[model samples]
Target: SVAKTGMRDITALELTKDMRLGWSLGNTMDAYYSAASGLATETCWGNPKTTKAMIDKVKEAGFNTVRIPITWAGHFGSAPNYTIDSAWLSRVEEIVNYVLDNDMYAIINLHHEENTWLVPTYANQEVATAQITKLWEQIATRFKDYSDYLIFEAMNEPRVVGGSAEWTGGTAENRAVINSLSLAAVNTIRATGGNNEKRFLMVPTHAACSLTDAVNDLVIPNNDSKIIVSLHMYSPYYFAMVSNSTPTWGTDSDKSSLSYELDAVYNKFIKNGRAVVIGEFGSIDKSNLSSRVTHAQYYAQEATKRGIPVCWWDNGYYGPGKDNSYALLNRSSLTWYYPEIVQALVKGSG
Candidate 1:
């Protein structure tokens, strides 16, 4: 085993200060499989060209970090725990390398794996601890040689459902389970001594660490220097995720209220100097383009003013056909639809 010292340490503070602008590539993995077959029907390799294209696209769009959410379970088979298919790992490496290659920051996390492998098996006190440890061990070992440009997040939305129940500040059992599993994963990586040691780790609290309980219940693993509290804010669910199919109730008045509410949240938690990052924020593309832009712009302004960085979660797939216009940078035109959004986020003073 390589001594942990060889690993590079990237802190969340460093990521926000130096690598704020970010975006997430959603649905690429799940999109490949047909709903019924559950097998690979399409494969998009994160090769050098594709990786470079994405990095260049984000950079041109004014983003400094790219959050690559990989579905490791899709490639994982039962037993000996899942070894991310070598090809899949290579593809991920290609993308991470692309970010670094462009001199930008990157974040890779245990995304959908939480629902499948992480929480389910790790739900058991002892079993969860060991499984979590092993998982990070493999992850740390794989990228031990990478630089601080690469950051790791323990898990994403590890609760029973998206918003059905609370992960923290709920029942004693729920709190204990989430806190224990989360901490164990952090310590497990730290103990290994690789990129895991000093690298920044984003910890998501139960209920997916959304605004609902973000302020009161988020637990920062013993180390706040390198750890950041990641919360995914999409308060008006109807507008953000269901805007296209649902009616839009958010008006300019609603935007004003949201701004005020978000201001309160930021002042309460982030004002104290703790590092905070918006892990995910965006609205449905089908919503009025101007309104969607307004919603995202409000968030960008707030984040910029606070000097906090945010990552937008999006998939090329949007509506009935899955062609979401919010894709930001159009791969075809090689241009950004909301260039003003980039300007607002990167230049706004609050």
Candidate 2:
């Protein structure tokens, strides 16, 4: 009973061109706050409250899209009903409106919810599918009227939360379960009717890891033609992600490694007419601004060259020695922490 709401449908290929360069509103709405720690607040992660002005600044910085990761564990009721808190939904809508109002694409997804519910595993397959379906049912019903500018990402890094093989893409059985849950999500959204019937949805593989196994295992849903695959890669992981590793990366080997990974995605997805998005990609500040800038430029340039737009992960932490400090813009002041790096990304994508 899925039907489009009288809106023009844009193919995944067409939408990819529109999302030239993207930014993530990380560590803000997606910040987890325990119920015991009092009511959840968006600023619990040391980030200032999001404002339209802040979003305007991002639009001004040459970013055409924004990925807003959100966790619903602390904001929704129990199962059966699993009703999302109305106030919470409204707040998210307000922020999404900021992006849409600016004529920029906005991507929202279920993030960090793997901790409590929706863990991707063969053992929890039945329960996980039920909860994920219910969650998206409510989400799609709420935003069914939104235009194509707003994209729904099924889940962020869906996989076994703390399993030993979590980073390695988990087991094949687990990936099988993930594929099923992803299709359930797509069908549920399309069933909601309205614009969702034609919405460009994103589906992620086990952990959304950039590992070849992870990328190769993703099963794109057959229920829709406007689907895009999501993958996150902090390439040259030793330099881009790991904290205590070498802080320089301009070697031919490093560049070759990046090219290989990009080609893997291009050959597997893009060349096949499926659009791919690097939902998250950034390097932490390690007192090596020059090296980080060079890596940033190369990564962006290479990914966009392959028709895969990259979204910079911004968590608002721009100090020294912080593990997740990929802060590109000062959210509070709406100024670029590294203007040269920002310029590199924009220019590289071009």
Candidate 3:
């Protein structure tokens, strides 16, 4: 195993300073399918195969971190044993290495797997905890030697998969169970030892939503200084995620609303001496390029000012007339599809 370097002993807040801006490798590895296939599923969502060059382009664009969301349900063996396919694990490690070798921070987490086998709920808490622990044990052991820059996120947007309130944050019971499972995963990793002992770990609230209720419900591990709270904020959702809605942004109210959200996070987590990360945040391309650029700038600027780092959610779908395509660069050619938005993000964060 390759050894890790850099400031491995710094606090999570100190580490946050190094992760000024980030990007998510979305809709790729996290794309799930029932029938198991090796790397074919990586492109199931219409993305090209991930490459070192693509990640290198991200770094060249001034991103300091990459969030690699992955799903393991289809890639692992049956229950009771729940062994992860070695080949699958190897491929993920290769991609992770691509980012680390580039001297940037990388975050890996259990993503869409929760939709099927690992749903978190009070009713399924026992099974959820078991599966989460089992999965993290494998992941933690595999990357045990990795440096602090290699963060282990417990899970991604965990909630009742298709519930009515899914995106709005699940029921109180659901949040409770998710919290238990998160802590269990944290304990599992810490038990694995190696660099994981003090390794930075990110845990998310119900649905990883930025809503006040969801943010207030998140239960951080007591006495653990290495924890970084993760939240996904696509604020002004009609502008960021919804395709057939408002096109322009950056009005005073829009900026105030976004700043209010960031302030809530800062006061709730950062003000309490805990570091927080906007695990995913970005506006979709609705042919509103100019307004989107301004929104990106203000979003990154406010988040950074409040001590919360932002990670843009890139799904590799930039093209003419495509709605909600958040691709920042051309994956195959490694060129900026929207250089201005990327620049705004980098400059605004600084």
Candidate 4:
């Protein structure tokens, strides 16, 4: 049904090279708005329950990495332990196995919990850090024996819950707290022993954006050479992620702006002998098919040149006149909603 990835004791750069394309299994496992029930949560976000067929389609499309965002806020136990529910953890592992069975990279990150207890403010830093330590230890211990094909993203978009500049970047204090919180995950995972000690870990900057302060202020464990920096960018906002606005793209200036952003990431991380993954990037559907293809084409073209692989964020919501919501593949039919855009991504990256 899909391709198998051959792996050995892989290094950070070596893994990134094979992950030429990536896709986020978005909104499926990360759905928390409905309830805390793990089995029910997978389909609560309107997408059908994730089937291995879905991931098979991914490998068929040339993606070697699948980012599975998972929410644990409502699924945890009491305050002191904050133990993840067994049933939920099992479900998470099953889906993670779904990726691994296909011989692809599986990224299990703490997702959606950011809006709950994972704030970056100093007042709640200890509480936040404790939760991260306990939760990731359990997660690591469970998958510790797995091969390097599995990756653990410490957290998703760590930032102030509602900071004034939350999305753009954050205050210096915010970046500092995020750094410590991320370190907690790294230290905890390494302590578990097994493949986890050498497993590639991903940490993102303030809000995970490629802004000036956000990119420059990131701190990775200098002691660990296998760490990867994760970033999310929707450049030229009005035309890309900000849906229902300025639906057309491909202007000279538009290309220039995107080029600048990618260059910033290249010079900072990739050029410094570090591996970088653009964990999320996409142009929303404003009913502009051609522009979307061009946007993806140019974005992937530039990103591959700099040695950073890109993942399209697909929340499984596709239609017209929407904002921030994007969908590439139709879950029910196992077909692409926008085949041209899909081809643009594959062809450009290829």
TM-score of every candidate relative to the true structure: 0.81, 0.96, 0.96, 0.96
Which segments of candidate 3 are over 4 A away from where they belong? 1-3, 319-323
Cα lDDT for residue 43, candidate 1: 42
Name the lDDT value of residue 23 in candidate 4. 91
Query: Residues 252-318, candidate 1, lDDT per residue (tens digit)?
Result: 7776776776676577556766676677777656636666656666777767667677787755443
lDDT of each residue in 117-227, candidate 4, tens digit only:
899989989999999999998999987887777889998898877779798699898998999998999999999987777788999998888888988888896658989
Candidate 3 local lDDT, 38-115, one digit each (tens): 668888888888888899899999999999989887888767668888888998998999899888899999988766
Task: Name every residue pair that clashes in candidate 3.
Answer: none
Q: What lDDT tens digits, residue by residue, belong to model 2 across residues 1-350? A: 01222355668888887798999999988998785432356889988999989999999989999999998888888877788889889999888888888888899999998888877777888888988999999999988988888899999988777888799877888788889999999999999977888889999878888677777778888846799999998897889887878899899998999999899888988898889889999999888889888998999999988999999998888876778788988987778889888999999989
Q: Measured by C-alpha RMSD in angstroms, how accurate is candidate 1? A: 4.7
Clashing residue pairs in candidate 1 are: 4-193, 9-198, 9-199, 10-199, 10-200, 122-128, 305-350, 317-322, 318-322, 318-324
CA lDDT for candidate 4? 0.85
Query: What is the lDDT, from 0 to 100, of the residue 200 in candidate 4?
Result: 89
Question: In model 1, which runs have C-alpha deviations exceeding 4 angstroms?
Answer: 1-14, 29-49, 120-123, 162-172, 211-215, 244-252, 318-325, 337-350
Note the Cα lDDT for every prediction shown: 0.63, 0.86, 0.86, 0.85
